[PDB]
Symmetry: C3
Subunit: 336 residues, 3 copies
């Protein structure tokens, strides 16, 4: 569009919500292209990531791991105000895999503590995409300290299957998956550090083994289980967006399926169907659409079951409604 | 269908055979929906997995690693009688990735030793699917002790390519790939245990490294070589089902291809074609269709070659027939 | 085709070029099927794989890691003269994933030092495909010693997207990604060896961890950076062929995309589109097509960022041209709150 045309576009401020929840949005675009405005403040803070009091100096967009899901439509502009308070100790920036140019925005958004920046980019490609911090010389460390999230760029006409039939979800959740690499002393106990930089050398040593100590959803072991399970009802259509900025994952809904799965996360690539377990390579986001058919507790996992059940990569859905004996029935219950 | 309608459907009792062979079945569905009945006894047994006499306490559906392939058609009912003998020591159950509800059947099939159960589920989705044991609190341990297999849910009109052209195999083989995590002593010799539970704590430590000590086909190094090499002839169309319940794999037929590969394992997702090496994520099954064109020895491997030739993920095919010099000829044999 | 019909086919002798460059070729086939002839000499040679001076005894097709990209069209015959000079100490062979029979040619190309062989195969399927050495009993050691490359079998009508539209690249690069497993001493410093065989047992131990010490493009940390950076211009269409003969990778162009990606490497399988990060399993090649829209530096990486930035799997593109503020603009440059 021409300079005047871009300047004339409506500007809309959106308030973000913490994962796994997603801010208000419409699936079908309302009106023509807009400049959708978001603000995130960066927080450096100690978080506890397991039941044994294990700490990480997190680097968190909007104070959360993962950072929040930002939702726009194709050919909207995403305009992010990014703030790095003077209480932080590191330079931070942002790389949007959805964006084109300047290392995804990373080269234009390098902000020291006490600085802010505003980046605008045109969301030319429909899909879910990773975003992450990427300070030159320390890229992986920032990313595995939790400084990553995702955005969704919806097609202007909403989602469709491979045959052009509309796929309209009733709810959407965003599951960000994080590999953490926590140093341990020679006794096997996880170390703690006073300042974020103090952990740098010990952490990189663990990173180089390529073996995470923890693999978690929403920033901690059990963050999406128990009373923090995600919810649905029988007949409800659910979109599950899943990201991993650094390492491969293989999501699986135990008791369910991915009816339609954009495994690559890109909406112009037709979705796979009837999936048992899908695969999202490190550095990407994917999305799965499922209509729930049975009530009960489901587990949603990375189906390397060691990562799921030993390292933390397991969430739950609690689903209300009536049981379908046609789909499944216990013909003879466990008996002597 | 109503319970009454289901009750009135034909029953067919199937007799299972040990992998890599697959029980007698039709590719095209013979008549309307049936209730297909299978029975499996759970055998906790010691298996030797390598030529060094390394032992695993296996947890084995039908006495094998992997468990046998069950074949039904879409919208059939799979009715499994699962038996846990008094000669066992652990609670076992079954999760069918093909099933909808109750953790794939796992919540409804928990049998203590001396108990049995009968689960029925509607096979609504066509494809190959993993099944595995999943006892709450010990899911990865059960799975990496060999308690997994796969089923095939065929389309009622049999297999087709991406454009609806029919694909009929002459032979079918089921390769179950297994990652084992065997503890070692301080000299690097593998440990032996006199009861399954004795290995638990040691085994969990190895599992947490995410690095298998062995990666094997059909339960042991060299299992599908020599007396167990798969066979075919030039001109023959072969389907190779491959599962991995816990860890990624990348099958490759050395000297051949995957002419058609349902890499995600799901038949409503069009297959990839002309594949050199395909990818199956942990927690999934896939299938490749190939027409042999050359005689001789072929190796079928996980194409991480360290996994194939150091850790044990290699099978052979012995193929009879006439050499084709158009496809390949030695113009000058190795010479000075 | 009969031996007589194949004898009647034209011959074309191709001079190979070193990666990441690709020898002259035509996207759309010129004429009917031909016998396309290549020669490679295998070199066992010491190579340096990082800025610290870490050495590997490499086993190298045409003297480079990766070996060079051979380009033919579907239904051409690729005829390779492979030479194992007497200065080498191991038997070598070649397995073409593109080929059908005799373990991809491995069974028919086993040459001791001082020997040569000529193999011909019909390139029946279009795509990019790995080739690698595979001597029985030492297969992964040969491969992770650098003895692998790729070929491209173009469709006779060139590349097209999943819907019949012609895709014509302006330039092509071949990025071979290599996992190395280098033994360390008790200091944690990389060990050097007098002869290739001296390193075997220590190397196999590292290999068994399934954890490479180095993951590199074009044979070394930073090999495709500085004056060796790949180049493009705004508006230019680039095909990037990427191979990994042993271990998975997840390519990503930082600041760009894969507009069309044959993630499986096979051209009869329709490409994925608008990709951020694609996935190529160990034992395969893939190809990505992109039209550059913005000038400046880009990094092309394996998006396990530890692999990219700690272990060496990062290359650079330098792109010339005019910046597009519609696509991206700094509304407010970094400035005090
Ligand atoms: Cu990135
Ligand atoms: Cu499962
Ligand atoms: Cu190979
Ligand atoms: Cu940061
Ligand atoms: Cu079990
Ligand atoms: Cu070799």
């Amino acid at each position: 569009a021409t300079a005047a045309e871009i300047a004339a576009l409506p500007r809309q401020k959106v308030e973000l919500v913490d994962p796994p929840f997603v801010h208000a949005h419409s699936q079908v675009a309302e009106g023509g292209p807009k400049v959708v405005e978001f603000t995130m403040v960066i927080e450096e803070k100690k978080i506890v990531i397991d039941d044994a009091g294990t700490e990480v100096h997190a680097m968190a967009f909007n104070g959360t791991v993962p950072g929040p899901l930002m939702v726009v439509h194709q050919d909207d502009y995403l305009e992010l105000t990014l703030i790095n308070p003077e209480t932080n100790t590191l330079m931070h920036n942002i790389d949007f895999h959805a964006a084109t140019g300047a290392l995804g925005g990373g080269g234009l958004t390098e902000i020291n503590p006490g600085e802010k920046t505003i980046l605008r980019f045109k969301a030319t490609k429909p899909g879910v995409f990773v975003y992450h911090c990427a300070p030159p010389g320390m890229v992986p460390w920032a990313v595995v300290s939790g400084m990553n999230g995702a955005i969704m760029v919806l097609p202007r006409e909403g989602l469709h299957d491979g045959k052009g039939k509309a796929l309209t979800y009733d709810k959407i959740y965003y599951v960000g998956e994080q590999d953490f690499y926590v140093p341990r002393d020679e006794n096997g106990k996880y170390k703690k550090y006073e300042a974020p930089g103090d952990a740098y050398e010990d952490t990189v040593k663990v990173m180089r083994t390529l073996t995470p100590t923890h693999v978690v959803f929403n920033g901690a072991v059990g963050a999406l289980t128990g009373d923090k399970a995600m919810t649905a009802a029988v007949g409800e259509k659910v979109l599950i967006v899943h990201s991993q900025a650094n390492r491969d994952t293989r999501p699986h809904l135990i008791g369910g399926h991915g009816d339609y799965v954009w495994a690559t996360g890109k909406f112009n690539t037709p979705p796979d169907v009837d999936q048992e377990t899908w695969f999202i390579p490190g550095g990407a986001a994917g999305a799965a659409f499922y209509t729930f058919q049975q009530p009960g507790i489901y587990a949603y996992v990375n189906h390397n079951l060691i990562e799921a059940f030993e390292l933390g990569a397991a969430a739950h859905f609690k689903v209300t409604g009536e049981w379908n004996d046609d789909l499944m029935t216990s013909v003879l219950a466990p008996s002597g």
